[PDB]
Homo-oligomer: A and B are copies of this chain.
Amino acid sequence: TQRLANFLVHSGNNFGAILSSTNVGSNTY
């Protein structure tokens, strides 16, 4: 089992998320 992945990203201005995992709760009780 061989798994090959290639990522090439070009960003000028990044205000959000790139190749990122974000967890937020923002819960109210």
* A residues whose Cβ falls under 8 Å from a Cβ of B: 1-29
Q: Which residues of B contact A26 (CB under 8 A)?
A: 23-27, 29
Q: Which residues of B contact A9 (CB under 8 A)?
A: 7-11, 18-19
A-B contact pairs, 28 of them (CB 8 A): A2-B2, A2-B3, A2-B4, A4-B5, A4-B6, A5-B5, A9-B9, A9-B19, A10-B11, A11-B12, A11-B18, A12-B14, A12-B16, A13-B13, A14-B14, A14-B18, A15-B16, A15-B24, A15-B27, A16-B17, A16-B25, A17-B19, A17-B22, A18-B20, A21-B22, A23-B23, A24-B24, A27-B29
Q: Is the CB of A29 within 8 A of B5?
A: yes
